[PDB]
Design a protein around this ligand. Structure first.
Ligand SMILES: CCCCC/C=C/C/C=C/C/C=C/C/C=C/CCCC(=O)O[C@@H](COC(=O)CCCCCCCCCCCCCCCCC)COP(=O)(O)O[C@@H]1[C@H](O)[C@H](O)[C@@H](OP(=O)(O)O)[C@H](OP(=O)(O)O)[C@H]1O
Ligand SMILES: *[C@@H]1O[C@H](CO)[C@@H](O)[C@H](O)[C@H]1NC(C)=O
Ligand SMILES: *[C@@H]1O[C@H](CO)[C@@H](O)[C@H](O)[C@H]1NC(C)=O
Ligand SMILES: *[C@@H]1O[C@H](CO)[C@@H](O)[C@H](O)[C@H]1NC(C)=O
Ligand SMILES: *[C@@H]1O[C@H](CO)[C@@H](O)[C@H](O)[C@H]1NC(C)=O
Ligand SMILES: *[C@@H]1O[C@H](CO)[C@@H](O)[C@H](O)[C@H]1NC(C)=O
Ligand SMILES: *[C@@H]1O[C@H](CO)[C@@H](O)[C@H](O)[C@H]1NC(C)=O
Ligand SMILES: [Ca+2]
Lengths: 332, 939
C-alpha cells in the first residue's frame, strides 16, 4: 500500500538543559531503510542525512527493521542549536538501493519542528529541622529565570496541593505558624506556565518520628489470629523494628515457627500471629521506629484467653446452689 | 292544665309548704287525699297495679332516679391530679434541667428520656388504678337495692314500711299515730308525729321506726327537696410522709456535698498544681466538665428520692379491697381496711352472728312428764295432743305459712315470725299436720288481736271453739305469764288446778336446767269461758290471768359450727371478744360458755344490765368515766341490755386511759337504734342480709354472709397491708445506702462516679418503680394471726429491718469497692480508672455496673421475708407479678449490656465474665442466709 502515517510526533517547544524524544511509526510495503532528514528552523528545504553519533552524541537515532518502520530520536542537552525540523520518510520503491537516481523516489512528508527556549531556574530556601521550638518556619522559592509568561504557582506536600496556594507569585512563600512533626514532609513549589512544562523543585522538611495511634492492648482466645499495629508520622519516613519484652528487658523476635507476619508500609506496621499458645505468646511487645533524627517507642500488651474459662464459675454456681438447698432443707 | 291537670311543679310547691302553713293546701285546692288521688289518675284502694304499658302516659314526668350522681372523672384529669405530687414535680424539674443542659452540651439527651420513664410509669399506674377502684365501688354499692318492690315506682299508694329510709315523699293518705325520725335531716333527733291535717306531709331523708298509716309516692329524683339539699354543695400516711421527707432531705445534702467535692478537686488540680492560664478558646472544655459534674449531682439526687413509696400504699390498698370483695367483706371507707389490723376488742350480738337463727324446739314438758328428746306422736295422750294442736293452730296467724326453703337444700326460709316456725315444727313433730287445721279454722269471734303489747309481749287469741265454747289462748314468755295461771293439763287429759305448791321448785326444775342447757322456754296458756253467755271482751282484766298451762317448750337456735374455731383464733391474736345480747342472763351465759368466749372456773364479770346502770351512773344521774374503768376490763357478757347502753359501753372502752395502749374497738350492729354505737367505734360492721338500712348506711364494713369468721378474714388482710409496705421499704433503703455512698466516695477519689448517669437512672427505675409492683402485691399467709397488735406508737423501721439493711449493705459495699480497686488484676483486663473525657466505654466499668444490678436483683428475692424466716422461696409461686418482673428485668439487663454500646457506656462482655457476675449474685443469697444467724437482742 501507499505510505500512510500512523503515529506522527507533535512539534516540540522545549527548553534548555532538557532531553526529549520523537517517535515516528510508519507502515512500510516494502519496508524502507528508515533514516531522518534534517532542516534548519528557518528553511525546511534542507534534507541533510541524520545519523547517530553526530554533535558529540547529543542526538541518538534508533530504528527497528520489521513489518513497521519505527524510529526513535533522543535529544539530550537541549540548547539553542537543537532548533530544527526533522522528517521521517517511507519509500515503497522496491529498487531503493539505487541511490544514484533522481529524487523522484516515493517519499512522504512527516516534518516536525523543535524549538528551545530558556531553562527555568528556581532558588529555594534551605532545609529546616523542626524541633520543639514554637518559632514559625518560612519556606521560600524564587523563579529567578523564567523566559515565559507565567500562569500560576502553588505549594504541594507529598504530592498534595496545599489549599489556597494559587496566585501569581513570581516568588512564593509558605509559613507554618506552629510547626509540628505532622507538618514535616517533601514540599514542592510547582510553577504552571501557559505553554511551558512545570518546574517543581524540592524543599524537604525533616522531623523526629511521632507515634500517632496504636492498640493499647489485645486479647484473643487461644488458637486464633492476633493483629497489632503502630501508625506514625514524620519525614523522611523511618525504619521499623519490632521487639518483645522478656525477663525485664527488650529482646528481638524471631519467625521461628513461621507464624509471624510483619507487613511494613510508609507508615503502619502490622504484626500478625496465628494459632496462639498460652505458653509463650502472652506478654508485651513494642514497636520501635528509628529515623535519621530520633527514635520513638510505644508498648502494647497481649493476653490470650484459655478456652476452659467458663468451667470454673459454673462449679462456683453449683457450689452455691448445693450449700443453699442443704441449709434450707435442714432448717425444717 | 290539660291532660296533666296537676303538674310536677304544683306538687313540688305543695311539698315545699309544710306544717300549719300546709293546712290550707291540705283541705283546699286539691280537696282531700282521695281528691289528690283523682288528680293523680289513681285510686285510694289500688292506685296503679304496676302495669308497664301505663308508663309515660299517666305522669310522663319521671325523668330519672339520679342513679349517676356526679361521675365527673376523666382519665386525663386523673393523670393531671396525680401528676401534682411533690416527688413527681422534683423528677420533672430534674428532667427539664438535664435536657436543657444537654441541648447546650457544646447520647447526652438520653438522660431526659430515661428519667421521663420514672414519671410516666408512675402517673399511668396510679390514675387508672383509682379509676378502676371507683368503678368497682360504683359496681358494688348500686347492687344495694331494698325494693316497695321495684327500683323506682311512681304514681302508687303503699302501706307503712318501717325500718327503711324513705326514698319517696308525699302526705300520708289515711292513718294514725304515724311517727317518723328526722334526726339527721333537720338536726333534731326528736320524733315528730304526723297529724292528719296539721302536718300530714312526709319527706325523704327520714328513718321510720314505728307507727301506722298509708302514704302515696310523689317523688321522682333530684327534684325532691332532699336532693335539693345536697345539690347545693389515716395515721399511716402521716408517718410515711414524714419518712419520705427525711429521706429526700438527706439525699439533697449528699448531692450538695458530692458536687462541691468534685468541682473543688478538679479546679485545685487544674490551677493550683498545673497552673494553666485561662485562654479565650479554653472555656468550652471547662463548660463540659462543669456540665458533667452537675448532671452527676442531679442524678444522685433523683436516685435517692423515693418516688415509688407513694405508689406502694395505693397499690396495696387497691389490691386488698378487691380481694376482700370476694371474702364476704364489702368495704366502703378505705381507712377501715388498715384500721382493722390494730383492732384489740370486738363487741358482738348473740342473734344473727353467733347463732344460725334456725331455732327448733328440743325439750318438752307435756302431761306432767318431761321429754328431753323429740316426743313421739303417741307418747303423750292423744287428747292433750289434739287440744294443744288446735290451740296453737287457732293462735297462729294465717299469713305465716311455711314457704319451703326458697332454694331448698341450700338456704332455709323460716317465714316471718321466727319462733312460730319452731312451734309449727313441733306440730309436725307430733305427727300432726298444721295446715289442715289452719285452713279449717275460719274467722271466728276475733277479739283475738291483743296487738302483741310491749309490756305483755303475748300473742293472744280469744275465740269460740267449733262447739261454741269461748276460750282465750296466749303464747308468751314462760316466766312473765307463769304466775298468770290457775290450771295445768295432766297426762290423762285432766285440768289439775295450779297451786302455789305446784308453783314451787317443780316448775324451776322443769325450766331452769333447760335454760342452762341453752334453751329459751315458752309456755302455752288458755283460759276457758262459759259457752252461754259470751265473755265480756271489754272486761279484759280477768281474761289475761288465771289461764291453763298446757305445756312448756324449750326452743333453741344452735351456734354455727365455724364460730368456735374463729373466736379461738381471735383470742390467739390478742383480740378479746365481749358479748352484748339483750336476752335472759342464764341463757346468754349458757350459750357463751359453749361458744368459747367464757371458760368455767375463772373470775369474769357478767351483768344483767340493771346493776350495770347502777354502777355506771353516779348519784346525780351522770357519767363519771371513773367507776366504769374498773368494770369493762373483766366484763364479758352483758344481758338484757338496751341499745343505748352499748353506746355508753363503747365510749367507756374507747376513751379509757387506764391501759397504756388505746383500745381500738369494732362493734357490730344491725338494729335501728344502734346508729351512735357504730358511729363512735373505730370501725362498724353491719350485717348484710339481716340488717336494717339505718345500720347499714352508718357503717364501714358490710358483711355479706352475716358470719363471725369473716371478721377474722378482715383482720388477716388488715395486718398484711402494713407488712407489705414494710418489706418494700426495706428493699429500697438498702439500695440507697449502697448507691449514694458509692457516688460520694468514688467521686472523692477517682474524680468520676463508677456508675455513670444513665446507669444510675436505670438502677433508680428498677428500685423505685418495679420494686413497688413486685413487693406490694403479696397475698397473705395464715401466720399473720399469731402476733400481737402493734398500736399507733411504733417506728416504721423495725429492729430487724435495720439488721437486714446493714447486713446487706456491708456485703455490697465490700464487693463493689474491691472490684473497683483491684478488679483489673482478677479478671486480667485493661484498667478503666482515671479515664479521660470522651473515652470509649471500658470493660472494667461494665463488670462493676453489671454486678451491682445483679446483686440488687438477687436481693429483691431475699427482701420478701422480714421476720427472720429462712425459706426465702416460700410461696414465691403464689404471685405471678413478682416472677414476671424479676425475669423481665434480668432479660432487659442482658440485652442492654450486650447491645448497649455508646449510649449506655457499656461494652459487650464475654461468657467468662457473665458467670462470675451471676456467681456474685448467688453469693448475695448465701450471705442473706448467714446474716439471719445473729440474734437482734445482743446488738
Ligand atoms: C437509714 O436507715 O437510712 C438512710 C437512707 O438514706 C438515704 O436514703 C439517703 C442518704 C444516703 C446516705 C446515708 C446512708 C437515712 O434515712 P433517714 O435519715 O431519712 O431515716 C432515718 C431512719 O428512718 C431512722 O430509723 C429514724 O430514726 P429516729 O426515729 O430515731 O429519728 C429516722 O426516720 P423516722 O424518724 O421517720 O423513722 C431517720 O433517722
Ligand atoms: C504575574 O504578573 C506578571 C505581570 O503581568 C506576569 O508577567 C506574570 O506572568 C504573572 N504570573 C502569573 C499570572 O502566574
Ligand atoms: C525571594 O522572593 C522574595 C519575595 O519576592 C524576595 O523578597 C526575596 O528577595 C527573593 N530572594 C532572592 C534571593 O531573590
Ligand atoms: C516535579 O517533577 C519532577 C520531575 O523529575 C518530579 O520528580 C517531582 O516529583 C515533581 N513534583 C511533584 C510535586 O510531583
Ligand atoms: C515467617 O515465615 C513466613 C512463611 O514464609 C512468612 O510469611 C513471614 O513473612 C515470615 N516472617 C517475617 C518476619 O518475614
Ligand atoms: C501516613 O499517615 C497519614 C495520616 O494518617 C495517612 O493518611 C497517610 O496515608 C500515610 N502516608 C503514607 C505515605 O503512608
Ligand atoms: C529505638 O531503637 C533505637 C535504635 O538505635 C534505640 O537507640 C532507642 O533507644 C529506641 N527507642 C527508645 C525510645 O527507646
Ligand atoms: Ca428514686
Amino acid at each position: 500500500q501507499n505510505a500512510g502515517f500512523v503515529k506522527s510526533p507533535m512539534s516540540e517547544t522545549k527548553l534548555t538543559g532538557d532531553a526529549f524524544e520523537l517517535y515516528c511509526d510508519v507502515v512500510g510495503s516494502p519496508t524502507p531503510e528508515i533514516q531522518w532528514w534534517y532542516a534548519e528552523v528557518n528553511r525546511a528545504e534542507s534534507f541533510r542525512q541524520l545519523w547517530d553519533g553526530a554533535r558529540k552524541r547529543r542526538v541518538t537515532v534508533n530504528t527497528a527493521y520489521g513489518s513497521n518502520g519505527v524510529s526513535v530520536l533522543r535529544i539530550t542537552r537541549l540548547t539553542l542549536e537543537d532548533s530544527g525540523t526533522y522528517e521521517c520518510r517511507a519509500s515503497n520503491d522496491p529498487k531503493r538501493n539505487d541511490l544514484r537516481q533522481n529524487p523522484s523516489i516515493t517519499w512522504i512528508r512527516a516534518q516536525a519542528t523543535i524549538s528551545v527556549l530558556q531553562k527555568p531556574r528556581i532558588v529555594t530556601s534551605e532545609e529546616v529541622i523542626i524541633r520543639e521550638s514554637l518559632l514559625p518556619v518560612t519556606l521560600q522559592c524564587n523563579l529567578t529565570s523564567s523566559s515565559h509568561t507565567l500562569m500560576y504557582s502553588y505549594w504541594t506536600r507529598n504530592g498534595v496541593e496545599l489549599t489556597a496556594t494559587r496566585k501569581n507569585a513570581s516568588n512564593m512563600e509558605y509559613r507554618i505558624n506552629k510547626p509540628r512533626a505532622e507538618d514535616s514532609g517533601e514540599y514542592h513549589c510547582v510553577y504552571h506556565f501557559v505553554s511551558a512544562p512545570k518546574a517543581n523543585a524540592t524543599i524537604e522538611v525533616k522531623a523526629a518520628p511521632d507515634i500517632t495511634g496504636h492498640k493499647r492492648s489485645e486479647n484473643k482466645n487461644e488458637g486464633q489470629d492476633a493483629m497489632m499495629y503502630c501508625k506514625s508520622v514524620g519525614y523522611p519516613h523511618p525504619e521499623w523494628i519490632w521487639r518483645k519484652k522478656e525477663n525485664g528487658v527488650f529482646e528481638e523476635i524471631s519467625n521461628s515457627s513461621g507464624r509471624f507476619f510483619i507487613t511494613n508500609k510508609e507508615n503502619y506496621t502490622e504484626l500478625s500471629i496465628v494459632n496462639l499458645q498460652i505458653t509463650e505468646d502472652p506478654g508485651e511487645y513494642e514497636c520501635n521506629a528509628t529515623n535519621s533524627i530520633g527514635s520513638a517507642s510505644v508498648s502494647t500488651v497481649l493476653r490470650v484467653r484459655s478456652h476452659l474459662a467458663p468451667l470454673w464459675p459454673f462449679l462456683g454456681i453449683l457450689a452455691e446452689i448445693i450449700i443453699l438447698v442443704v441449709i434450707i432443707v435442714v432448717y425444717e | 292544665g290539660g291532660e296533666f291537670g296537676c303538674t310536677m311543679e304544683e306538687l313540688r310547691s305543695l311539698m315545699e309548704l309544710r306544717g300549719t302553713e300546709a293546712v290550707v293546701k291540705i283541705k283546699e285546692t286539691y280537696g282531700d287525699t282521695e281528691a289528690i288521688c283523682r288528680r293523680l289518675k289513681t285510686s285510694p284502694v289500688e292506685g296503679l297495679p304496676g302495669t308497664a304499658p301505663d308508663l309515660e302516659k299517666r305522669k310522663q314526668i319521671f325523668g330519672q332516679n339520679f342513679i349517676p350522681p356526679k361521675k365527673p372523672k376523666t382519665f386525663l384529669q386523673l393523670v393531671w391530679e396525680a401528676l401534682q405530687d411533690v416527688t413527681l414535680i422534683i423528677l420533672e424539674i430534674a428532667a427539664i434541667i438535664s435536657l436543657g443542659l444537654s441541648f447546650y452540651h457544646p447520647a447526652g439527651w438520653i438522660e431526659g428520656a430515661a428519667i421521663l420513664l420514672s414519671v410516666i410509669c408512675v402517673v399511668l399506674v396510679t390514675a387508672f388504678n383509682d379509676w378502676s377502684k371507683e368503678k368497682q365501688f360504683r359496681g358494688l354499692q348500686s347492687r344495694i337495692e331494698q325494693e316497695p318492690v321495684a327500683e323506682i315506682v311512681v304514681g302508687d299508694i303503699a302501706q307503712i314500711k318501717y325500718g327503711d329510709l324513705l326514698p319517696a315523699d308525699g302526705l300520708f293518705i289515711q292513718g294514725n299515730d304515724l311517727k317518723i325520725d328526722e334526726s339527721s335531716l333537720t338536726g333534731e333527733s326528736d320524733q315528730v308525729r304526723k297529724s292528719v291535717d296539721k302536718d300530714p306531709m312526709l319527706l325523704s331523708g327520714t328513718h321510720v321506726m314505728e307507727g301506722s298509716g298509708r302514704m302515696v309516692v310523689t317523688a321522682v329524683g333530684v327534684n325532691s327537696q332532699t336532693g335539693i339539699i345536697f345539690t347545693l354543695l389515716s395515721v399511716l400516711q402521716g408517718k410515711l410522709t414524714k419518712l419520705a421527707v427525711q429521706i429526700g432531705k438527706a439525699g439533697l445534702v449528699m448531692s450538695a456535698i458530692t458536687v462541691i467535692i468534685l468541682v473543688l478537686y478538679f479546679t485545685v488540680d487544674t490551677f493550683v498544681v498545673n497552673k494553666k492560664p485561662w485562654l479565650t478558646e479554653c472555656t468550652p472544655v471547662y463548660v463540659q466538665y462543669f456540665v458533667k459534674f452537675f448532671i452527676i449531682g442531679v442524678t444522685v439526687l433523683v436516685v435517692a428520692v423515693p418516688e415509688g413509696l407513694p405508689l406502694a400504699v395505693t397499690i396495696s390498698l387497691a389490691y386488698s379491697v378487691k380481694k376482700m370483695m370476694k371474702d364476704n367483706n364489702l368495704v366502703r371507707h378505705l381507712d377501715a381496711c388498715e384500721t382493722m389490723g390494730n383492732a384489740t376488742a370486738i363487741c358482738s350480738d348473740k342473734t344473727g352472728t353467733l347463732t344460725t337463727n334456725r331455732m327448733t324446739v328440743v325439750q318438752a314438758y307435756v302431761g306432767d312428764v318431761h321429754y328431753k328428746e323429740i316426743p313421739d306422736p303417741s307418747s303423750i295422750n292423744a287428747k292433750t295432743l289434739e287440744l294443744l294442736v288446735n290451740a296453737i293452730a287457732i293462735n297462729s296467724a294465717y299469713t305465716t305459712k311455711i314457704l319451703p326453703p326458697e332454694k331448698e337444700g341450700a338456704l332455709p326460709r323460716q317465714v316471718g315470725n321466727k319462733t312460730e316456725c319452731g312451734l309449727l315444727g313441733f306440730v309436725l313433730d307430733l305427727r300432726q299436720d298444721y295446715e289442715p287445721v289452719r285452713s279449717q279454722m275460719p274467722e271466728e269471734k276475733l277479739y283475738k288481736v291483743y296487738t302483741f303489747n310491749s309490756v305483755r309481749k303475748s300473742m293472744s287469741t280469744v275465740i269460740k271453739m267449733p262447739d261454741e265454747s269461748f276460750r282465750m289462748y296466749s303464747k308468751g314468755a314462760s316466766e312473765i305469764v307463769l304466775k298468770k295461771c290457775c290450771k295445768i293439763l295432766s297426762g290423762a287429759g285432766e285440768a289439775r288446778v295450779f297451786r302455789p305448791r305446784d308453783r314451787d321448785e317443780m316448775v324451776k326444775k322443769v325450766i331452769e336446767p333447760m335454760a342452762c342447757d341453752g334453751l329459751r322456754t315458752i309456755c302455752v296458756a288458755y283460759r276457758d269461758f262459759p259457752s252461754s253467755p259470751e265473755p265480756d271482751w271489754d272486761n279484759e282484766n280477768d281474761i289475761l290471768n288465771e289461764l291453763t298451762c298446757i305445756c312448756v317448750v324449750g326452743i333453741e337456735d344452735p351456734v354455727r359450727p365455724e364460730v368456735p374455731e374463729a373466736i379461738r383464733k381471735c383470742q390467739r391474736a390478742g383480740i378479746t371478744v365481749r358479748m352484748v345480747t339483750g336476752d335472759n342472763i342464764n341463757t346468754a351465759r349458757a350459750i357463751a360458755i359453749k361458744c368459747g368466749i367464757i371458760h368455767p372456773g375463772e373470775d369474769f364479770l357478767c351483768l344483767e344490765g340493771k346493776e350495770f346502770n347502777r354502777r355506771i351512773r353516779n348519784e346525780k344521774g351522770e357519767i363519771e368515766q371513773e367507776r366504769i374503768d374498773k368494770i369493762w376490763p373483766k366484763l364479758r357478757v352483758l344481758a338484757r341490755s338496751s341499745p343505748t347502753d352499748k353506746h355508753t359501753l363503747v365510749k367507756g372502752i374507747i376513751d379509757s386511759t387506764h391501759t397504756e395502749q388505746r383500745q381500738v374497738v369494732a362493734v357490730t350492729g344491725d338494729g335501728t337504734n344502734d346508729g351512735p354505737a357504730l358511729k363512735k367505734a373505730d370501725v362498724g360492721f353491719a350485717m348484710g342480709i339481716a340488717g336494717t338500712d339505718v345500720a347499714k348506711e352508718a357503717s364501714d364494713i358490710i358483711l355479706t354472709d352475716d358470719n363471725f369468721s369473716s371478721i377474722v378474714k378482715a383482720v388477716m388482710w388488715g395486718r398484711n397491708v402494713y407488712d407489705s409496705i414494710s418489706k418494700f421499704l426495706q428493699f429500697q433503703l438498702t439500695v440507697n445506702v449502697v448507691a449514694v455512698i458509692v457516688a460520694f466516695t468514688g467521686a472523692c477519689i477517682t474524680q468520676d462516679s463508677p456508675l455513670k448517669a444513665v446507669q444510675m437512672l436505670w438502677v433508680n427505675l428498677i428500685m423505685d418503680t418495679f420494686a413497688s409492683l413486685a413487693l406490694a402485691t403479696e397475698p397473705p399467709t395464715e401466720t399473720l394471726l399469731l402476733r400481737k397488735p402493734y398500736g399507733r406508737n411504733k417506728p416504721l423501721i423495725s429492729r430487724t429491718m435495720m439488721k437486714n439493711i446493714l447486713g446487706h449493705a456491708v456485703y455490697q459495699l465490700t464487693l463493689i469497692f474491691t472490684l473497683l480497686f483491684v478488679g483489673e488484676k482478677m479478671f486480667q483486663i485493661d484498667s478503666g480508672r482515671n479515664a479521660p473525657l470522651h473515652s470509649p466505654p471500658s470493660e472494667h466499668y461494665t463488670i462493676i455496673f453489671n454486678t451491682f444490678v445483679m446483686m440488687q436483683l438477687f436481693n429483691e428475692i431475699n427482701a420478701r421475708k422480714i421476720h427472720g424466716e429462712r425459706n426465702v422461696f416460700d410461696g414465691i409461686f403464689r404471685n405471678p407479678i413478682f416472677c414476671t418482673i424479676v425475669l423481665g428485668t434480668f432479660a432487659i439487663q442482658i440485652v442492654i449490656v450486650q447491645f448497649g454500646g455508646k449510649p449506655f457506656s457499656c461494652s459487650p462482655l464475654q461468657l467468662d465474665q457473665w458467670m462470675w457476675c451471676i456467681f456474685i449474685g448467688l453469693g448475695e443469697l448465701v450471705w442473706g442466709q448467714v446474716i439471719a444467724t445473729i440474734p437482734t437482742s445482743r446488738l
